[PDB]
Design a protein around this ligand. Structure first.
Ligand SMILES: OCc1ccc(NC[C@@]2(Cc3ccc(C(F)(F)F)cc3)CCN(Cc3c[nH]c4ccccc34)C2)c(N(O)O)c1
Ligand SMILES: Nc1ncnc2c1ncn2[C@@H]1O[C@H](COP(=O)(O)O)[C@@H](OP(=O)(O)O)[C@H]1O
Length: 258
């Protein structure tokens, strides 16, 4: 196809929850658009100063009166969300995913993606990387590796609060598998009920380029396979290597598509 000059603004809002292929999708969107896509990894590796800004936004988010129409407080919240996303062409993962409805209002010409998978596969992956149970010895390893990356209790607070925001829960028993599974199903159902079907593409793991590129009116990237990255096995290796070497920069060449 012809090469066209794309606008550097949010063009794709991904509502999929963590551990549903968000990092592969982030990489795929960057391959298509040649501009950055937001993701929790963007916070960890490039924008740790944003943690407090996202926390402030979530703290104020209960004051969002759903447009139409737009109220004054909603403008202030929407302005900070637009500021956080300046320079990006897409959003994936926490903390953004729970803001899908607000992002749809801020970027009325953006399209929405929802990545889904088997709920028990999702929970297993979540417990190995994002939310280990409080009695799991692996949790102490994750925390040791996280300190190497400079992540403190405020980072864990952001993950917890952005998950609570996505699930629309005032509190959440993070150690309760039944609660998490029910929240997962209700969240994915709600996205499909809320977003007009014309504006939504539901993606399953393994779907690859073709449905995504058709939805976005772009050519399939020539000679580039669809990304497959961020397996729990790979995250376990990363944690162990951070513990062993005590720095990101000593191991970063071992993890190419991070
Ligand atoms: O790809 C989607 C996606 C992948 C991972 C995460 N987070 C996993 C975590 C951050 C992390 C660490 C290392 C790396 C790496 F890759 F550099 F190694 C990446 C990310 C989140 C925090 N910690 C668990 C924890 C330990 N004690 C807690 C107490 C309360 C709550 C959580 C925790 C690992 C998210 N989040 O958090 O949205 C999204
Ligand atoms: N192209 C692809 N095909 C199949 N699974 C993929 C994939 N890209 C990522 N995944 C899976 O999606 C999960 C990572 O999602 P996220 O990036 O949102 O954290 C991992 O699950 P597992 O942990 O079960 O391996 C990973 O294996």
């Amino acid at each position: 196809g012809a090469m066209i000059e794309s606008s550097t603004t949010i063009q794709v809002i991904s509502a999929g929850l963590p551990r549903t292929g968000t990092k592969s999708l982030k990489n795929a969107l960057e391959i298509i658009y040649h501009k950055p896509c937001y993701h929790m990894f963007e916070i960890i590796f490039n924008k740790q100063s944003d943690i407090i800004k996202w926390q402030n936004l979530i703290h104020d988010s209960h004051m969002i009166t759903t447009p139409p129409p737009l109220t004054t407080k909603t403008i202030a919240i929407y302005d900070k969300l637009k500021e956080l996303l300046d320079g990006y062409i897409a959003t994936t993962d926490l903390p953004t995913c729970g803001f899908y409805k607000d992002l749809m209002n801020i970027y009325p010409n953006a399209k929405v993606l929802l990545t889904i998978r088997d709920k028990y596969d999702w929970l297993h992956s979540l417990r190995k990387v994002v939310l280990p149970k409080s009695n799991d010895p692996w949790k102490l390893k994750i925390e040791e590796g996280d300190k190497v990356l400079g992540l403190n209790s405020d980072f864990y607070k952001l993950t917890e609060d952005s998950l609570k925001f996505a699930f629309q829960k005032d509190d959440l028993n993070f150690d309760d598998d039944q609660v998490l599974l029910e929240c997962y199903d209700e969240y994915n159902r709600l996205v499909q009920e809320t977003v007009p079907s014309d504006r939504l593409l539901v993606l399953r793991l393994g779907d690859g380029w073709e449905p995504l590129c058709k939805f976005l009116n772009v050519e399939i990237p020539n000679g580039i396979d669809y990304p497959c990255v961020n397996s729990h096995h790979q995250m376990t290796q990363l944690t162990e290597q951070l513990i062993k070497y005590k720095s990101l920069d000593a191991i970063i060449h071992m993890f190419p598509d991070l």
